[PDB]
Amino acid sequence: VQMTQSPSSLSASVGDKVSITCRASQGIADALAWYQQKPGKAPKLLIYGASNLESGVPSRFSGSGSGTDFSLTISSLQAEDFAVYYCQQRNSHPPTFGQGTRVEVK
Amino acid sequence: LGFLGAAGSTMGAASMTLTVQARNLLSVWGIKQLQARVLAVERYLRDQQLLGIWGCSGKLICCTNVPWNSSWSNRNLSEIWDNMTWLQWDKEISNYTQIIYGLLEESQNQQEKNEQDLLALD
């Protein structure tokens, strides 16, 4: 399954609500995860199962979507949330990732 | 020899073919076969459930802790195993079959399993 993530050049202020979306070339039910990668750092898993949040991740992050249409919503984009976000499916082998959305500070 | 081949044999000799009979219990013109298949399965499962609740699951010959009551049959072993068939026995004790089953349910599972449940701590 190929994953397309957009927008690739999102920018926002430290107080804005943002939404990053992606599309699967095939329906994958809810077999999707979202990751956060700081420059020079290990990616962190934020969301699994499309709608489920990991322990250690604040309620600020929320996932939604099913089938082919998925999104990640950040209710308030604090300074620690400017990172490359990735869309990843595990519905069919091999695992695949989207190209990533780099969230910039205006 | 063969399915029900021992039906005319004595109970002792007939007890050696339990797999011969057991293996033949599971295996217009469309719905009759589906009902026949479902019936065979339900009868099989009712007998397996009885074996389960008596602590006899997975066995064709199962020893119990229920004593034999002479009121059910006062014959000795020679006249049951060597000089009698299973059809005759089934006829002779049909009136007591449910009594025996009740006793098997009570002492071979309800009491025995709680005793085993307690012996697993002490």
Partner: protein
Amino acid sequence: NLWVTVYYGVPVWKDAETTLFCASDHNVWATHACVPTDPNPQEIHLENVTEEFNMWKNNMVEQMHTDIISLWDQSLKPCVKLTPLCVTLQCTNVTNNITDDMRGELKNCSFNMTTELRDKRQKVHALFYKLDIVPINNTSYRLINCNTAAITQACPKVSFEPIPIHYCAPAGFAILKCKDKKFNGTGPCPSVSTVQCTHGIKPVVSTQLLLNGSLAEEEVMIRSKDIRNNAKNILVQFNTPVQINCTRPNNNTRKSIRIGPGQWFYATGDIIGDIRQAHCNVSKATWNETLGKVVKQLRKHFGNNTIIRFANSSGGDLEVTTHSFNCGGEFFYCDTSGLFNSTWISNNDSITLPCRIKQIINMWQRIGQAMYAPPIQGVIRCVSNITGLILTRDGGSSTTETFRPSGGDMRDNWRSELYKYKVVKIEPLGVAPTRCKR
């Protein structure tokens, strides 16, 4: 110190009434819906097992009868209906090379029926048997019961040839077969075997004479529900077959007349050559030897100095007064008065039976349903053997007993085959005392 020991797989059974299915090695009986048979059927002798059999209460007969009725109905259900033919017919006599006996038997009937288009009508003709036509009143005729029964045309592509049906028990059940060569239908059977399925029983539908099927192993068997009750039928099973050669000598054609969108009515068209009466032949010596055997067996119940008389049917439905059968799709009604006409007093050549043919028949005596048998092209010859009789006694208590042919209840035909079988259920679980303690 005896203890209850539970045994599973015990060779014990009880009488049971269950659903049986079929096996067989298109046709009316939808035999393609049957499972494959065992390439090497396993008949297992139950040595030292004596079972009580009763062919008169055998539930396999009622179940087979029900199956035959249901198969018949689903076979005819998708076939062309003949309601457009319940119209006034204008009929004249066929006079083309007709014999003295075939005078009035076949009528050349014209009628107005629709054609390829719904508005266009054509005058069409068919040759119908006298028995299929009833006068309306002047040459105006109608098909028999065309307004009181729904006549369904049989599909010409669905064969009426009996195909053996093997009745098979559900798992957990078994069929017990009686191997006693002298078994008379009721009581203990000291030689019993268990089978997976019955032998192949052909669903042959006939009256008076049992055609094809099983023969007695040693001698003619006289089986009755109550031999002293003259209202019961007597099933006579032959030990030797009697060959009966039946024919429909006319060379028939089939005239296919459009009746609906892609639907045709198949009329008898014209007859090629001359018109002669259908008939059946049996050898006089074979038949007389067979009756001598039947009489010798009847005297075992009636007295060694009693005169045994055979006579024809006293009356009733055509299917009962005559020998009804089906050869190649044609339905024959043969006059057996030449077969049951003798007096046996205690102390080469052939018999020709005239036969009538019908196209509109009502099998299983159902109200509001009838079938039209489509014509069979060419000339029909079939050779069947008689394996038994259905007889009825006059009684009326005299030193003489009179036996007449009977029939019409097809259960008796199935019963004549399903007499050595009973269905039992297996009771594999049981208990017995042993000295073994858990």
